[PDB]
mmCIF file of C-alpha atoms (C1' of nucleotides) and ligand atoms in Angstrom:
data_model
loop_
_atom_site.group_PDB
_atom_site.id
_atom_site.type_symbol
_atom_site.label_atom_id
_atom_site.label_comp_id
_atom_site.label_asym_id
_atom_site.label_seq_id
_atom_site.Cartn_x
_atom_site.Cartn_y
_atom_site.Cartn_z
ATOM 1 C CA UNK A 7 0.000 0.000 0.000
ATOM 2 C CA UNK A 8 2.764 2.321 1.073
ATOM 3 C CA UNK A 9 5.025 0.897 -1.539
ATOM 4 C CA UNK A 10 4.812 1.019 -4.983
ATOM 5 C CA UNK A 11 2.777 3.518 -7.706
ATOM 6 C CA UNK A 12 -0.098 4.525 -6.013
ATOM 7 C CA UNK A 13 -3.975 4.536 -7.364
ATOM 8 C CA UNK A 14 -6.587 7.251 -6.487
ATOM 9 C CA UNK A 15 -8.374 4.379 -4.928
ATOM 10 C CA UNK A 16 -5.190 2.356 -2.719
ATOM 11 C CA UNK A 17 -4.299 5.951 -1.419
ATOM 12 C CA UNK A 18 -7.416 8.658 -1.207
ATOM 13 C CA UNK A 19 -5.410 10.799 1.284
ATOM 14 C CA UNK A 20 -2.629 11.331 -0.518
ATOM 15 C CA UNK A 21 -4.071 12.659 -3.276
ATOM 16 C CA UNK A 22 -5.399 16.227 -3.990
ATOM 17 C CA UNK A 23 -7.990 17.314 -6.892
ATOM 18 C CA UNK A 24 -7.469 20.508 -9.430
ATOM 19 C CA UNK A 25 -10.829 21.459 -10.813
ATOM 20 C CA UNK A 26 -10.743 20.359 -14.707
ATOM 21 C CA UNK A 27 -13.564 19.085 -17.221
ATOM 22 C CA UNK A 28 -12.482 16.243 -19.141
ATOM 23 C CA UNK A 29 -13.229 18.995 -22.267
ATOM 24 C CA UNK A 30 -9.925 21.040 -21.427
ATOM 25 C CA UNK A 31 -7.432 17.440 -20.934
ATOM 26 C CA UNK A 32 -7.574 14.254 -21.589
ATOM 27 C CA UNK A 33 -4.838 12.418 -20.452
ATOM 28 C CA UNK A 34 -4.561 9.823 -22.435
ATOM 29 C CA UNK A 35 -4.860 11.512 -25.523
ATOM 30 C CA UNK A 36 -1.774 14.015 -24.553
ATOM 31 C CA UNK A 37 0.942 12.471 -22.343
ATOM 32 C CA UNK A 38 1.573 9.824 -24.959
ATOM 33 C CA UNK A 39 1.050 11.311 -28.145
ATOM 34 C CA UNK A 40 4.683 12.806 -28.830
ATOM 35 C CA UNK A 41 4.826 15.995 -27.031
ATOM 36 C CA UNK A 42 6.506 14.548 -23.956
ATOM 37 C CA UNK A 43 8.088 10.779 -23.615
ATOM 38 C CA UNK A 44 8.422 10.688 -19.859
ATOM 39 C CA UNK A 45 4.798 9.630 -19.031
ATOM 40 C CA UNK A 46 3.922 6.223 -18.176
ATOM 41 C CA UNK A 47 0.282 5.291 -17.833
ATOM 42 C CA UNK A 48 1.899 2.401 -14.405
ATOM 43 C CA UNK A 49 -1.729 1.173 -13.782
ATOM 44 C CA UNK A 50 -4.932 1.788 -15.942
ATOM 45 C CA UNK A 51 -5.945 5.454 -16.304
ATOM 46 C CA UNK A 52 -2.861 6.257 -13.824
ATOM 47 C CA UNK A 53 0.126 8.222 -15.398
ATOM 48 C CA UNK A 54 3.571 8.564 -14.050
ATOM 49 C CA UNK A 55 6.628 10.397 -14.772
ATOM 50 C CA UNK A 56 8.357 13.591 -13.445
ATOM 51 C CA UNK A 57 7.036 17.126 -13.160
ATOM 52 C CA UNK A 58 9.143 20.273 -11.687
ATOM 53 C CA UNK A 59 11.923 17.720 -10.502
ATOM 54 C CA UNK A 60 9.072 15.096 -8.595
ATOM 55 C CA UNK A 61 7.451 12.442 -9.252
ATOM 56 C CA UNK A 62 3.652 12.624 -10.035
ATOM 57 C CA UNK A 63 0.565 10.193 -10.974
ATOM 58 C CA UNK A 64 -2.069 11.744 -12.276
ATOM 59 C CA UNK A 65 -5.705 10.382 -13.090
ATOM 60 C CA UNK A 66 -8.457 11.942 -13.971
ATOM 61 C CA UNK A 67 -12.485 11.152 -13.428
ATOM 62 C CA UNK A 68 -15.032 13.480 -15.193
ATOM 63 C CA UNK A 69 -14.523 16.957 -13.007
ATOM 64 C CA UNK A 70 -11.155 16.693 -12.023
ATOM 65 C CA UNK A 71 -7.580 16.099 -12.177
ATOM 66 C CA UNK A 72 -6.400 14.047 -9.168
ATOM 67 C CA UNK A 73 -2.630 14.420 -8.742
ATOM 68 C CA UNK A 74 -0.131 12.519 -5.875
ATOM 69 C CA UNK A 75 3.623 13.469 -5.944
ATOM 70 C CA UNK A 76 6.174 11.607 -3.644
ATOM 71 C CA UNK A 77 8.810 13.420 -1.978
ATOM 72 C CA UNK A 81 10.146 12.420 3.409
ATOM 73 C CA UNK A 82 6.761 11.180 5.341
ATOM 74 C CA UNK A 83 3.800 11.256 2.576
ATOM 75 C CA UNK A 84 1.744 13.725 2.451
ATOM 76 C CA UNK A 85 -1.024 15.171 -0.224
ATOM 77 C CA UNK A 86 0.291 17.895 -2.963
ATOM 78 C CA UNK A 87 0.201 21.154 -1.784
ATOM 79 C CA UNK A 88 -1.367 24.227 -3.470
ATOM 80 C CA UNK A 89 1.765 25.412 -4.671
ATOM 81 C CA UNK A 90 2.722 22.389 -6.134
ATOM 82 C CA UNK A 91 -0.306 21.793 -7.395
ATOM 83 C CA UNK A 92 -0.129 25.121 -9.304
ATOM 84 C CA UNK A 93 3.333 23.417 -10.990
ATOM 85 C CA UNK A 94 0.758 21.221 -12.331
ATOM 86 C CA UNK A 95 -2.015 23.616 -13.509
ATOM 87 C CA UNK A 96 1.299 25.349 -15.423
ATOM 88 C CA UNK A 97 2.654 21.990 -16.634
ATOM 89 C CA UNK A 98 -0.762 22.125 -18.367
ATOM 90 C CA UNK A 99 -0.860 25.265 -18.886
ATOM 91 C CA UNK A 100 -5.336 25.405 -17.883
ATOM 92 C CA UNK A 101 -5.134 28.818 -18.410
ATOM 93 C CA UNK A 102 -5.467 28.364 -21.610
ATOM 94 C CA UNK A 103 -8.803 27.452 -22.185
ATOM 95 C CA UNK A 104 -9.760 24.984 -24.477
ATOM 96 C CA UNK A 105 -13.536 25.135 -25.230
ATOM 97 C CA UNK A 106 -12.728 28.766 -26.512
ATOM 98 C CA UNK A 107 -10.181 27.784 -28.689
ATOM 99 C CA UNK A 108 -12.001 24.799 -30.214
ATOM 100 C CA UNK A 109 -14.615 26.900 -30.626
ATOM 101 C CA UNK A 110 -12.499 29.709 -32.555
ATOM 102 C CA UNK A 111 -10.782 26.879 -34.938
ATOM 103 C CA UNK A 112 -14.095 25.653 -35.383
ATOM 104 C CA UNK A 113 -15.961 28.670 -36.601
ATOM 105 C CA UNK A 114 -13.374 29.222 -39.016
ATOM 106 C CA UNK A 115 -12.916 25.853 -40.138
ATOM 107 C CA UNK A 116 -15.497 22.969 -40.666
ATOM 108 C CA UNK A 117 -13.116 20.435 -40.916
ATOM 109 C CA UNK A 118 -11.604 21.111 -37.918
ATOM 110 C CA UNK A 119 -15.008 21.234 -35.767
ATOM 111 C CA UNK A 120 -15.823 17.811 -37.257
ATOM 112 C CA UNK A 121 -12.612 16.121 -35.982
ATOM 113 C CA UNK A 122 -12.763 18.202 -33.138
ATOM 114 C CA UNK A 123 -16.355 16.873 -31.527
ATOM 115 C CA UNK A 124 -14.601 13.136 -30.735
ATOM 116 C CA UNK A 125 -10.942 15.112 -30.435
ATOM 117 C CA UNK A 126 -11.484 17.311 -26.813
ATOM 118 C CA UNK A 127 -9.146 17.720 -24.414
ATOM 119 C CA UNK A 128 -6.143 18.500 -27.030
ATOM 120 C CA UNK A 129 -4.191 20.725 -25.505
ATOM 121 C CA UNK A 130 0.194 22.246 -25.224
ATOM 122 C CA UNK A 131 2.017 21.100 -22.256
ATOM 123 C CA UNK A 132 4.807 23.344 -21.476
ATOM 124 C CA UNK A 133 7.697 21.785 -21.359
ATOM 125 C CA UNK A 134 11.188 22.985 -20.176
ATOM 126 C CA UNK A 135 13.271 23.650 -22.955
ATOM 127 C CA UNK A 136 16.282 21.587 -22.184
ATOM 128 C CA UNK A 137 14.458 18.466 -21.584
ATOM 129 C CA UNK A 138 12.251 19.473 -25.274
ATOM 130 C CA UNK A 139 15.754 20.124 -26.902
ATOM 131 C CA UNK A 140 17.127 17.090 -26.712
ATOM 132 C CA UNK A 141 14.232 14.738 -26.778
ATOM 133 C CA UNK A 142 13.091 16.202 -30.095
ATOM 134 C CA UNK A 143 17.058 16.300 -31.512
ATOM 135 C CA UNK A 144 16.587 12.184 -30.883
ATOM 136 C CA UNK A 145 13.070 12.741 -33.020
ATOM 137 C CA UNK A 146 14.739 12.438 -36.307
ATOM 138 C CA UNK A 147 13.965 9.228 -38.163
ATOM 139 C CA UNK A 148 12.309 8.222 -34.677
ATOM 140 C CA UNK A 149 8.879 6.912 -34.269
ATOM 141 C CA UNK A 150 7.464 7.568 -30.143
ATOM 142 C CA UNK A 151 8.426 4.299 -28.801
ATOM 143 C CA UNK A 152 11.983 4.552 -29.860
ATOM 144 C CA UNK A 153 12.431 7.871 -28.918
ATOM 145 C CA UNK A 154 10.703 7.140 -25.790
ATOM 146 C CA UNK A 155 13.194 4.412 -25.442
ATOM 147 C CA UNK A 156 15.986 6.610 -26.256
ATOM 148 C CA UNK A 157 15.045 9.275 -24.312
ATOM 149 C CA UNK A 158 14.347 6.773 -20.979
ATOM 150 C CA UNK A 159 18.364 5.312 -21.230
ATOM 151 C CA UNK A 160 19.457 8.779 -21.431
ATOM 152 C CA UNK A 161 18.061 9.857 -18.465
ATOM 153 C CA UNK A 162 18.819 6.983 -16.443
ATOM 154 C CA UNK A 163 22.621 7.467 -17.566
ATOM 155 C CA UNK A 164 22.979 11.017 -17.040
ATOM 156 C CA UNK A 165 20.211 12.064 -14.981
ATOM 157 C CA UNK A 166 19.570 12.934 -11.249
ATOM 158 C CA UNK A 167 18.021 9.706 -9.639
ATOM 159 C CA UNK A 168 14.851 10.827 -7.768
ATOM 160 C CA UNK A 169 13.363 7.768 -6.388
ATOM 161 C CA UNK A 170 12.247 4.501 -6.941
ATOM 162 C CA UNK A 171 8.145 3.179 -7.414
ATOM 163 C CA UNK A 172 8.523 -0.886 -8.034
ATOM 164 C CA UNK A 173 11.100 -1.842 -10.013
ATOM 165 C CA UNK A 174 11.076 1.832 -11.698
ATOM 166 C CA UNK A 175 13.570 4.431 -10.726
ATOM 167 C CA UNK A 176 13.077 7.741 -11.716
ATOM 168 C CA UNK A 177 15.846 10.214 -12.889
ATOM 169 C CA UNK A 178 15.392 13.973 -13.471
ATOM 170 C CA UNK A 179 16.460 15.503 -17.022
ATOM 171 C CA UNK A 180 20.340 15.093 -17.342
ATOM 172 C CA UNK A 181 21.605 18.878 -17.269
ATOM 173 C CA UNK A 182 23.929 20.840 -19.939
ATOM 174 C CA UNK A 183 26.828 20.096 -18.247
ATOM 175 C CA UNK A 184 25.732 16.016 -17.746
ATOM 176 C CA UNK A 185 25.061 16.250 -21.702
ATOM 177 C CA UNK A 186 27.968 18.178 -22.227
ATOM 178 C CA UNK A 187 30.716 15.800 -20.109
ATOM 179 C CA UNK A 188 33.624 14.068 -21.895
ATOM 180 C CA UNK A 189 32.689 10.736 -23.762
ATOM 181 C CA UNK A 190 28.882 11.530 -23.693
ATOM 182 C CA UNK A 191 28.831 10.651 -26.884
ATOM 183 C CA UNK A 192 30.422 7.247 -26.667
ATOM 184 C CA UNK A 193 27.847 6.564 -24.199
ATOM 185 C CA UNK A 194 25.386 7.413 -25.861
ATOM 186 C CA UNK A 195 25.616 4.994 -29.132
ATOM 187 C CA UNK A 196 26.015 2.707 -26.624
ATOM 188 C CA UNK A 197 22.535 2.980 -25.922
ATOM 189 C CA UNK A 198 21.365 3.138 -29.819
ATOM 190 C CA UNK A 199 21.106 6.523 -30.188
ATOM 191 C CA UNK A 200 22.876 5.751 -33.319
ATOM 192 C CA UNK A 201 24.030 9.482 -35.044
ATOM 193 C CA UNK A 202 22.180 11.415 -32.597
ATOM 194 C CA UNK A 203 24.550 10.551 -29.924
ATOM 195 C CA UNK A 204 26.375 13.461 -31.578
ATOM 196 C CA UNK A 205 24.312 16.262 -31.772
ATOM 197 C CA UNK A 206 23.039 15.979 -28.135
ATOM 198 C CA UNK A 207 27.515 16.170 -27.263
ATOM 199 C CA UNK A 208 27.501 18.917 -29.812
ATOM 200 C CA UNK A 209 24.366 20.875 -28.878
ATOM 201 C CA UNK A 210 25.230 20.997 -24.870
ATOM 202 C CA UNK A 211 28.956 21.204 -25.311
ATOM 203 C CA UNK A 212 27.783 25.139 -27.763
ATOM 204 C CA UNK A 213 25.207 26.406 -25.555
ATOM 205 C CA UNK A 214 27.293 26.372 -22.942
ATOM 206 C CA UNK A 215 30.688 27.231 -24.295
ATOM 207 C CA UNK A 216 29.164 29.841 -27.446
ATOM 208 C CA UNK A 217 26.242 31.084 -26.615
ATOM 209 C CA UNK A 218 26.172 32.024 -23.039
ATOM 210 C CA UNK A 219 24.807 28.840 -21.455
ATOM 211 C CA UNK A 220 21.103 27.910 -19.905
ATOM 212 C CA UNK A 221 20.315 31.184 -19.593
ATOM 213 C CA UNK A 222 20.304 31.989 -23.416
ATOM 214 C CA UNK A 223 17.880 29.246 -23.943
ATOM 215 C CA UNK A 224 15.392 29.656 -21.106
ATOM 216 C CA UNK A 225 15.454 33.577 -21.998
ATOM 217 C CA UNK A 226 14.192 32.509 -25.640
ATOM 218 C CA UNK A 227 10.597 32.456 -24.068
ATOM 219 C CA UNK A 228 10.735 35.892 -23.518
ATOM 220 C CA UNK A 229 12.155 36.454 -27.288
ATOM 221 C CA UNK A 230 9.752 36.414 -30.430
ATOM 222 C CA UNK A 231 8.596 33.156 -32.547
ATOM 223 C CA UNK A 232 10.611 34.418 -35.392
ATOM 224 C CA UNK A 233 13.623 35.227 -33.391
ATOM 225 C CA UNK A 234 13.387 31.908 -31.044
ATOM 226 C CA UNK A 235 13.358 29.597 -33.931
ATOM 227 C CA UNK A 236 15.925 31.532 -35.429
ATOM 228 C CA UNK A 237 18.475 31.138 -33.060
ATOM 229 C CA UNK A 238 17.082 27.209 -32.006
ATOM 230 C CA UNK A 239 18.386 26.407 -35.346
ATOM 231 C CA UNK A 240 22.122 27.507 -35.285
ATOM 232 C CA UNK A 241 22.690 24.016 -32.444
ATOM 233 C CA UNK A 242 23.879 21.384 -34.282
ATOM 234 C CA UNK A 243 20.619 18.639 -35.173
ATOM 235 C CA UNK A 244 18.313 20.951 -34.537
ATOM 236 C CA UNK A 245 16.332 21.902 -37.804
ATOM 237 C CA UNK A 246 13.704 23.774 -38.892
ATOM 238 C CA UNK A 247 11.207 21.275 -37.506
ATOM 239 C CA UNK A 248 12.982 20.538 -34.032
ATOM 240 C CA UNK A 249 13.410 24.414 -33.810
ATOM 241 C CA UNK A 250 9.494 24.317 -34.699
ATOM 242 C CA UNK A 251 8.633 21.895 -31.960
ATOM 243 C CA UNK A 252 10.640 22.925 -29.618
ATOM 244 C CA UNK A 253 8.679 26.789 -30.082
ATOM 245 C CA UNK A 254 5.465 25.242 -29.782
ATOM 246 C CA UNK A 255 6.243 23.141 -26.934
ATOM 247 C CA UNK A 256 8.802 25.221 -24.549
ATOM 248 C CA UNK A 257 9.060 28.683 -25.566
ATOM 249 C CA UNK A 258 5.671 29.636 -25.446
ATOM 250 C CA UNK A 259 5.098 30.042 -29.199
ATOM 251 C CA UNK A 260 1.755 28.482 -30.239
ATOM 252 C CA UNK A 261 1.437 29.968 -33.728
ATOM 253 C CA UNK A 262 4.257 27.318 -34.381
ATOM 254 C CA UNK A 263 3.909 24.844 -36.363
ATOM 255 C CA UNK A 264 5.791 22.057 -36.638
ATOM 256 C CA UNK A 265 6.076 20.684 -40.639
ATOM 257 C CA UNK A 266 6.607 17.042 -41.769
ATOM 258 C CA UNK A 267 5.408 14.254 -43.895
ATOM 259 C CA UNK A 268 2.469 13.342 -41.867
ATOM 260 C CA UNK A 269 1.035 16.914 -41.478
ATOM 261 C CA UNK A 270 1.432 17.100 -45.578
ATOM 262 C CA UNK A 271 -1.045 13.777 -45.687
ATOM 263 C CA UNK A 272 -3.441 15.531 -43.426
ATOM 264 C CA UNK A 273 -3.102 19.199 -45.699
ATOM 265 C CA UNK A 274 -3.888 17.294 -48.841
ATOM 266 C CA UNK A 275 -6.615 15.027 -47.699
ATOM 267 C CA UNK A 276 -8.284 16.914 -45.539
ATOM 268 C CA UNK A 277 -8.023 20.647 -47.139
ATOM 269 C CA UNK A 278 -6.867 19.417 -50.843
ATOM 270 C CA UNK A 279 -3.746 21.728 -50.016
ATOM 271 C CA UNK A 280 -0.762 22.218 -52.366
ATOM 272 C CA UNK A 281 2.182 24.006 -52.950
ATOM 273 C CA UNK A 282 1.390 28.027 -54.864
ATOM 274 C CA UNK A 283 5.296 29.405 -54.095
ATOM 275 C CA UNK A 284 7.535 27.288 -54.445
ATOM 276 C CA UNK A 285 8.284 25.016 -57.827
ATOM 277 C CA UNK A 286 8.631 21.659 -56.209
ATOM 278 C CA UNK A 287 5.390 20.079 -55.496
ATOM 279 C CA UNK A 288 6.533 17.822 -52.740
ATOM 280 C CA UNK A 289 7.921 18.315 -49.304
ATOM 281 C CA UNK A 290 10.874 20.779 -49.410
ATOM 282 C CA UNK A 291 12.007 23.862 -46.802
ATOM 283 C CA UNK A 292 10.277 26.360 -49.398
ATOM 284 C CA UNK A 293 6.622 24.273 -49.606
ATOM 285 C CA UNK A 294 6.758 23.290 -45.924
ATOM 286 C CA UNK A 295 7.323 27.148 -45.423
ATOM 287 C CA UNK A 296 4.267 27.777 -47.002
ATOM 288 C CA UNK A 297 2.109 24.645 -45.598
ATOM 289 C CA UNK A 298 3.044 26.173 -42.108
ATOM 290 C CA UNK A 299 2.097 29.697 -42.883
ATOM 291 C CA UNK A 300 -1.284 28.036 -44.291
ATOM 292 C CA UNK A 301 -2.258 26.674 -41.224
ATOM 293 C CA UNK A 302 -1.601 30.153 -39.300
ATOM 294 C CA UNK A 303 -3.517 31.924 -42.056
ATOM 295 C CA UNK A 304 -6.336 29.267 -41.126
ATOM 296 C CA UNK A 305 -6.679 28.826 -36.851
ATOM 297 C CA UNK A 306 -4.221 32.134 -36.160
ATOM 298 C CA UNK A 307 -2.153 32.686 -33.131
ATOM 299 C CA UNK A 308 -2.437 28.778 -31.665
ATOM 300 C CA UNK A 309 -2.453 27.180 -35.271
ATOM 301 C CA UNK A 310 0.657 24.695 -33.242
ATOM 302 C CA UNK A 311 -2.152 23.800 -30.620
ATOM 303 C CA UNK A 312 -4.552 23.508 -33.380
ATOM 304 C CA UNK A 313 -2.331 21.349 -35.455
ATOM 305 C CA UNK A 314 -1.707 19.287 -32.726
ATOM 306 C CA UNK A 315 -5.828 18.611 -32.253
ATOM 307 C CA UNK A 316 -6.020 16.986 -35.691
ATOM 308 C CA UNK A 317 -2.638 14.962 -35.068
ATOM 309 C CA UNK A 318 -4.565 13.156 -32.038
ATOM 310 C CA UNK A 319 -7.600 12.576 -34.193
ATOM 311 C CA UNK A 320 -5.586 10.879 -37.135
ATOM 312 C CA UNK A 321 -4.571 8.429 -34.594
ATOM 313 C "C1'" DA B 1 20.107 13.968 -53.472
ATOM 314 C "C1'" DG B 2 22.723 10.873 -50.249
ATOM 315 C "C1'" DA B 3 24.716 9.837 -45.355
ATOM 316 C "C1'" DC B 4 24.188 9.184 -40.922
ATOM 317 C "C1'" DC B 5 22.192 4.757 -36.819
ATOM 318 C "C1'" DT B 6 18.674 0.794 -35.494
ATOM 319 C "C1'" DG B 7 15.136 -1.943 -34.287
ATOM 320 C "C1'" DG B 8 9.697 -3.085 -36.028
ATOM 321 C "C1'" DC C 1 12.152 1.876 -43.639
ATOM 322 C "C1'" DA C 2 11.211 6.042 -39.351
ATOM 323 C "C1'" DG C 3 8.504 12.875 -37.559
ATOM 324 C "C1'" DG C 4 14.939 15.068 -39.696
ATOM 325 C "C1'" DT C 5 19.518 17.420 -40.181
ATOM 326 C "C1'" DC C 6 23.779 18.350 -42.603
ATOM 327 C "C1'" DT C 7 26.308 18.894 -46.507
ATOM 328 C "C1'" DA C 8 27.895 18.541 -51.549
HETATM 329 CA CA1 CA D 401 21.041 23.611 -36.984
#
DNA sequence: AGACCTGG
DNA sequence: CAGGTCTA
């Protein structure tokens, strides 16, 4: 009882409620669907994994959003770290305005959208989104989930251990940036990538000025964020796009591949008017993004990410 | 337009 | 072959 992941049910003391309709979160359809790898769903409807450097299960019924962190001597979350979780989420955002705003201005979207609710950003801290998207490259989520799980157990902070699961915290720039990181790395098949996360921790610390250049992006513009993203080595237009949308506060991004070019020209018989080449390319996938902003507006990225859920 | 790294 | 990135 005391031991292992707990259950809303095997622990009702030790957990504490956040007021939240089903309509702004579901779960399941965001803590597993590529925006973050580090949740687990331990026990049916139960998800674990670590929030502002703790461990957390969360589980939801139709009202609310039950959350349990473990620290010593147990105890239920307290308001302030329960607000770590209403930011995680980011619920100020509402969602049943924005679906309603997408779907006014697009039918499509409002048909998806009725089975779809609960679609929402989680804001992420940009280190931890840096590198998890730099091993996204020729990735699908369960090997970068895998990937990103070996990393953290090598480099990372060990917080504690639920079962046979031990939990690490997000290895820092310095971890990353050690001497044979790299090595290690391939070790654990992350094949080429091994390389860019060296290369990436070893420059923003020793030619850019460090953490602080990155977290201080948030405060900086879409354009200029993804601008300066994409001078790291394996970060890309895309990773700079997903990192944008999913740490640095800028929801008008949107993130361009293959999959989002099916969905374009199925569901909105989209194709290429600038550019020559008629397939995916940095000039058409240029335009495909600013399509989508010219469609939803300021959170086409959270839009985006609404019809991503719904095509599985 | 290839090369870079591996399981499904 | 997979959500891409880097380079010729
Ligand atoms: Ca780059």
């Amino acid at each position: 009882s005391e031991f292992g992941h707990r259950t809303l049910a095997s622990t009702p003391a030790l957990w504490a409620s956040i007021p939240c309709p089903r309509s702004e979160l579901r779960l399941d359809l965001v803590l597993p669907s590529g925006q973050s790898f580090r949740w687990r769903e331990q026990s049916p409807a139960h998800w674990s994994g670590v929030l502002a450097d703790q461990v957390w299960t969360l589980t939801q019924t139709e009202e609310q959003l039950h959350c349990t962190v473990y620290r010593s001597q147990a105890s239920r979350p307290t308001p302030d770290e329960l607000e770590a979780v209403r930011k995680y989420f980011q619920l100020d955002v509402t969602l049943a305005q924005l679906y309603h705003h997408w779907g006014s201005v697009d039918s499509h979207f409002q048909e998806v959208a009725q089975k779809f609710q609960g679609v929402r950003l989680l804001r992420q801290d940009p280190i931890e989104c840096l590198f998890s998207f730099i091993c996204s490259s020729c990735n699908n989520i369960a090997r970068i989930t895998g990937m990103v799980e070996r990393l953290c157990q090598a480099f990372g902070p060990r917080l504690i251990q639920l079962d046979d699961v031990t939990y690490h915290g997000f290895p820092s720039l310095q971890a990353l940036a050690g001497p044979e990181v790299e090595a290690h790395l391939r070790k654990l098949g992350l094949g080429y990538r091994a390389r860019y996360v060296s290369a990436s921790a070893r420059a923003i610390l020793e030619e850019q000025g460090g953490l602080a250049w990155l977290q201080q992006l948030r405060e900086s513009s879409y354009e200029e964020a993804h601008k300066a993203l994409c001078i790291l080595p394996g970060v890309g237009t895309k990773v700079a796009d997903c990192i944008c949308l999913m740490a640095l506060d800028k929801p008008q991004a949107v993130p361009v591949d293959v999959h989002m070019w099916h969905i374009a020209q199925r569901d909105y018989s989209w194709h290429p008017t600038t550019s020559q080449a008629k397939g995916p390319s940095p000039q058409t996938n240029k335009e495909l993004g600013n399509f989508f902003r010219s469609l939803w507006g300021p959170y086409a990225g959270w839009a985006f990410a609404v019809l991503f859920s719904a095509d599985l």
